[PDB]
Amino acid sequence: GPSFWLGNETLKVPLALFALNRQRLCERLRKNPAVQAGSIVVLQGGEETQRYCTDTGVLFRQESFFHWAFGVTEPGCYGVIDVDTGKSTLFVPRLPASHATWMGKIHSKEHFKEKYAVDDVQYVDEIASVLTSQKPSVLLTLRGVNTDSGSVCREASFDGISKFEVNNTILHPEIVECQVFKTDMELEVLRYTNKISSEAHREVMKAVKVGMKEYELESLFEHYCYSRGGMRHSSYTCICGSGENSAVLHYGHAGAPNDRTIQNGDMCLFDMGGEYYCFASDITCSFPANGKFTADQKAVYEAVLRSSRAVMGAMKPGVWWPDMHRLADRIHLEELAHMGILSGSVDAMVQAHLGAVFMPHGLGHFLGIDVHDVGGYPEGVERIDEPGLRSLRTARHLQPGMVLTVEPGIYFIDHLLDEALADPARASFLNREVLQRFRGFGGVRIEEDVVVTDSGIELLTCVPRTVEEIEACMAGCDAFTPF
Amino acid sequence: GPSFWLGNETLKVPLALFALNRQRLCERLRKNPAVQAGSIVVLQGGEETQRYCTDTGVLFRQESFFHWAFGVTEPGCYGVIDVDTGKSTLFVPRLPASHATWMGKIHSKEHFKEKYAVDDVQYVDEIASVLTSQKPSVLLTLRGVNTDSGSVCREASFDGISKFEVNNTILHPEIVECQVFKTDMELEVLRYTNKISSEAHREVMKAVKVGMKEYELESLFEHYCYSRGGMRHSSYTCICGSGENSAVLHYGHAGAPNDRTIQNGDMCLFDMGGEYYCFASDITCSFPANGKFTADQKAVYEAVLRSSRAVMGAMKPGVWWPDMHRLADRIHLEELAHMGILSGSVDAMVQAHLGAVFMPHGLGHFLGIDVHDVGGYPEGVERIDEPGLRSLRTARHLQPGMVLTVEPGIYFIDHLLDEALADPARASFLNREVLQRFRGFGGVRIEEDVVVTDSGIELLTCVPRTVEEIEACMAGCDAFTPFS
Ligand code: PRO
Ligand code: PRO
Ligand SMILES: [Mn+2]
Ligand SMILES: [Mn+2]
Ligand SMILES: [Mn+2]
Numbered sequence: 001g002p003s004f005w006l007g008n009e010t011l012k013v014p015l016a017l018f019a020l021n022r023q024r025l026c027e028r029l030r031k032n033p034a035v036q037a038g039s040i041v042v043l044q045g046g047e048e049t050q051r052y053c054t055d056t057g058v059l060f061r062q063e064s065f066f067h068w069a070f071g072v073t074e075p076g077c078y079g080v081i082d083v084d085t086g087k088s089t090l091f092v093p094r095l096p097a098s099h100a101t102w103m104g105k106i107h108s109k110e111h112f113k114e115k116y117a118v119d120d121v122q123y124v125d126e127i128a129s130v131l132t133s134q135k136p137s138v139l140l141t142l143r144g145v146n147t148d149s150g151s152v153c154r155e156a157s158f159d160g161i162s163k164f165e166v167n168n169t170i171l172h173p174e175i176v177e178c179q180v181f182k183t184d185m186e187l188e189v190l191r192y193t194n195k196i197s198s199e200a201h202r203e204v205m206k207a208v209k210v211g212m213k214e215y216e217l218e219s220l221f222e223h224y225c226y227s228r229g230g231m232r233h234s235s236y237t238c239i240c241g242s243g244e245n246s247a248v249l250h251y252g253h254a255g256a257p258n259d260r261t262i263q264n265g266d267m268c269l270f271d272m273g274g275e276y277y278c279f280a281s282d283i284t285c286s287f288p289a290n291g292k293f294t295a296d297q298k299a300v301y302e303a304v305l306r307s308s309r310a311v312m313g314a315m316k317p318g319v320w321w322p323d324m325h326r327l328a329d330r331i332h333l334e335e336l337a338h339m340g341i342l343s344g345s346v347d348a349m350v351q352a353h354l355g356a357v358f359m360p361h362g363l364g365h366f367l368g369i370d371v372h373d374v375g376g377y378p379e380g381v382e383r384i385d386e387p388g389l390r391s392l393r394t395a396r397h398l399q400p401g402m403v404l405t406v407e408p409g410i411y412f413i414d415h416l417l418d419e420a421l422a423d424p425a426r427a428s429f430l431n432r433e434v435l436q437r438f439r440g441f442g443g444v445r446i447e448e449d450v451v452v453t454d455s456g457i458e459l460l461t462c463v464p465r466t467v468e469e470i471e472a473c474m475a476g477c478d479a480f481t482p483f
Numbered sequence: 484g485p486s487f488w489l490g491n492e493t494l495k496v497p498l499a500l501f502a503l504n505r506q507r508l509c510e511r512l513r514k515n516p517a518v519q520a521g522s523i524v525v526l527q528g529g530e531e532t533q534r535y536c537t538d539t540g541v542l543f544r545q546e547s548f549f550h551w552a553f554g555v556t557e558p559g560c561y562g563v564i565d566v567d568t569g570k571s572t573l574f575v576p577r578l579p580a581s582h583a584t585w586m587g588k589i590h591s592k593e594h595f596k597e598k599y600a601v602d603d604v605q606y607v608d609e610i611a612s613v614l615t616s617q618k619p620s621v622l623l624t625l626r627g628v629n630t631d632s633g634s635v636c637r638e639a640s641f642d643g644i645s646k647f648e649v650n651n652t653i654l655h656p657e658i659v660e661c662q663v664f665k666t667d668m669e670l671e672v673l674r675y676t677n678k679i680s681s682e683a684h685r686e687v688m689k690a691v692k693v694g695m696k697e698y699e700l701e702s703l704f705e706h707y708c709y710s711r712g713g714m715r716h717s718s719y720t721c722i723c724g725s726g727e728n729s730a731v732l733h734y735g736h737a738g739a740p741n742d743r744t745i746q747n748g749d750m751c752l753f754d755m756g757g758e759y760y761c762f763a764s765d766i767t768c769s770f771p772a773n774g775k776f777t778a779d780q781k782a783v784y785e786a787v788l789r790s791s792r793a794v795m796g797a798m799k800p801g802v803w804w805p806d807m808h809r810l811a812d813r814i815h816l817e818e819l820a821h822m823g824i825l826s827g828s829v830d831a832m833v834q835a836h837l838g839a840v841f842m843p844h845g846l847g848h849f850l851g852i853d854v855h856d857v858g859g860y861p862e863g864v865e866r867i868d869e870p871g872l873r874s875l876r877t878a879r880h881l882q883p884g885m886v887l888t889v890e891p892g893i894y895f896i897d898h899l900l901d902e903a904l905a906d907p908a909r910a911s912f913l914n915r916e917v918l919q920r921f922r923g924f925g926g927v928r929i930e931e932d933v934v935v936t937d938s939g940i941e942l943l944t945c946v947p948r949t950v951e952e953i954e955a956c957m958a959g960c961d962a963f964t965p966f967s
């Protein structure tokens with residue numbers, strides 16, 4: 001069967017991947033007692049956009065649910081699936097003659113049928129007529145709430161849809177639940193995105209020099225991923241935090257745009273992940289700008305390495321993800337006590353939520369077509385109302401096929417530290433004279449992507465992690481030399 | 484005063500640039516009979532967005548009118564300008580405490596005042612109160628139609644604006660007319676974006692090898708522009724057309740995504756331009772993939788080079804831009820005849836609109852904060868209803884301070900050639916036995932950015948252009964002398 005491929009050494013992704021997703025979705029809907037025979041899933045693809053009211057085109061990236069089901073890269077499409085038979089129909093825009101001048105070849109419907117291995121291809125302007133002839137009982141459309149953005153996913157619509165019976169409640173929970181469990185074909189793509197992004201992280205560690213701007217490494221990373229990996233997009237805006245900016249969790253956005261000069265003595269926290277054919281990677285490396293950990297940097301770093309490997313060591317089916325978050329909290333507190341930043345009973349520190357002062361984010365999240373993938377909080381799964389834990393993007397138990405990030409960190413964040421020092425229940429644990437030395441340290445995050453297996457996990461990421469590995473990598477003389 | 488700067492060798496852009504733009508806008512408004520005393524210009528900045536319903540953030544790029552007036556990089560702002568005094572007030576988001584954890588320092592209003600050199604800074608939720616206290620006669624908001632996209636620019640709104648008198652017709656043509664004429668400070672930025680993008684094009688010509696994917700050069704271009712120029716964005720999606728793809732004017736979008744392997748004997752047409760602090764560049768270089776022009780490639784290429792230099796040499800204040808387009812058409816037809824592709828009377832070819840078969844787009848467009856800059860078709864200026872010319876993004880006369888692209892091209896586009904061959908009014912000019920050799924050739928576009936000056940033009944772009952220069956650049960020399 002056909003494959004998506006960007007040539008060179010890039011991954012061939014079989015279009016059978018998306019056919020399998022459609023089949024799995026149908027199989028799940030068929031078991032839902034509320035789904036009527038003769039139902040048809042109706043999805044609307046993303047459309048071309050421009051910047052504001054300008055005619056400056058925005059590079060099109062497909063909507064994630066549509067991509068999961070069809071793998072279609074072109075804007076302006078719809079796709080439907082007959083639930084009972086699994087038959088798929090792709091609807092493509094009927095393009096004007098001038099498209100040939102400005103945009104490229106006007107491909108035939110047969111070209112698209114062969115390209116995407118769907119059962120049928122029609123034009124978008126025929127969708128009402130085509131669906132009518134199929135005499136569906138009900139159209140199943142996609143509407144629901146993303147539990148990370150809080151946004152409502154907008155359901156498909158077309159001229160004439162009002163003439164049909166439409167249900168917009170059944171589909172969203174079902175397709176989300178399919179996306180949560182990755183197929184072997186999807187795992188092959190996530191192995192690849194992690195391979196290329198890991199290589200890119202290594203090249204960045206080799207390239208970093210005191211005096212560079214943070215964004216020079218953002219640029220280098222994205223250049224490696226695109227030129228060598230075929231990754232035209234990143235999975236999220238690159239986070240290239242040096243010095244105190246490494247305490248800012250999502251540093252790098254337009255308001256803080258990776259524009260600091262890296263200085264001797266800084267820690268770097270680089271959270272970057274290329275995207276291939278709308279599949280994510282999400283990796284963070286932490287390391288000294290000058291290639292040599294100081295004693296304080298080694299201590300903080302190895303604390304996070306300890307929680308990282310303890311969590312990965314414990315992860316297996318049936319483990320409750322909030323228990324892993326609490327395990328990381330406890331290890332951080334133990335290590336910060338060993339360092340002298342903390343004193344007293346770690347049990348009591350845990351009871352006072354002191355861990356969240358140092359790690360004010362969730363331990364990790366589902367990953368897939370989106371970096372913060374869907375399905376973390378389905379109906380019946382509640383958010384835990386405690387510092388740190390309330391930022392968890394899922395409170396589920398682990399099962400095979402789930403893909404998770406494992407991303408403990410320790411940060412020295414002034415407003416959180418100051419709050420803790422004002423609270424007698426927490427201040428007694430904090431040694432002010434030692435902590436003072438760590439003001440402006442930034443932080444350390446060690447982020448791996450893993451897959452839950454029957455007996456444990458599979459690690460997808462492959463970057464240097466021990467202090468020795470990191471220092472060796474940064475001192476390496478050799479491979480990637482743009483102009 | 485303060486400047487925008489991304490360090491290293493990047494350009495320091497004084498915030499005074501935006502102060503001057505506000506001043507110029509007020510000066511224009513004070514002369515406008517539709518404008519009464521006590522008016523306040525109210526602009527709304529862009530907001531941050533995410534991909535579809537996901538929480539994947541999209542990198543924020545400021546809305547172009549707002550950028551022109553204020554130079555503000557942060558999402559969620561508004562900005563107002565008192566027309567009579569010129570006093571500027573920036574409104575910034577009142578951020579949640581958690582911003583300090585996730586996004587960075589919660590800067591003070593004073594920080595933004597110093598940063599942007601405005602007269603006052605307030606929080607966005609206070610805009611109704613602050614405007615009420617000023618007792619304005621009317622709020623002037625921005626609404627109009629972009630003549631390239633057809634889109635309606637959406638006016639500012641805030642909770643309570645219905646309590647004010649609002650006019651949404653006066654401002655748009657006036658701010659557009661200011662934008663058409665670049666200040667010396669703006670020209671400094673456009674010289675810089677052309678400098679960096681030119682360097683990047685030269686690095687690309689040096690790096691191109693048979694066997695590479697088109698997108699490898701897209702990547703390399705953008706990497707040069709960001710790491711060396713501080714250009715986080717491109718001005719438009721890179722067009723890296725090799726072989727027959729060079730006939731596709733805006734190749735490289737998601738449906739044709741720069742994914743062809745470059746072959747020996749191919750021509751390349753690379754239209755790429757980095758953006759710095761929301762100022763554009765727009766440059767096209769055409770060259771043989773293997774570094775050596777064939778006789779056929781040299782002939783097509785030098786035809787476009789001739790029209791490029793003819794137009795640049797003719798441009799000056801008072802010139803009607805459609806006359807430059809017709810000049811390019813005539814030169815292309817002459818040179819296609821000199822190559823044996825066409826025969827007969829060039830006067831007759833022109834009369835038959837044959838030029839548009841080979842150049843089915845406008846000769847060039849205004850450039851500024853947007854690659855297709857505003858103001859090409861103000862009220863009164865009409866689109867010419869002919870092939871090629873109707874695609875012109877302006878039919879204005881040239882004046883000092885305008886910034887234009889000059890981008891003639893010749894392409895071999897099958898459905899257009901076949902239309903001509905089926906049309907008795909055009910078919911006899913075409914020599915099939917010679918044209919057949921150019922089927923699948925793709926095309927050549929040579930695109931320069933220029934400023935209209937009192938005496939003619941200032942060429943901003945600095946890339947190799949002659950056959951000799953290009954071959955040398957690709958051989959690693961980079962080496963050449965610009966048009967003057
Ligand atoms: O947003 C999240 O969930 C993770 C936490 C640290 C950075 N990214
Ligand atoms: O869009 C335009 O006007 C120019 C013509 C060739 C490519 N870009
Ligand atoms: Mn991350
Ligand atoms: Mn993550
Ligand atoms: Mn161009």
Ligand SMILES: [Mn+2]
Nearest residue numbers: 765888890930
């Ligand atoms: Mn142009």
Ligand SMILES: [O-]
Nearest residue numbers: 271282407447
């Ligand atoms: O992350």
Ligand SMILES: [O-]
Nearest residue numbers: 754765890930
């Ligand atoms: O262009």
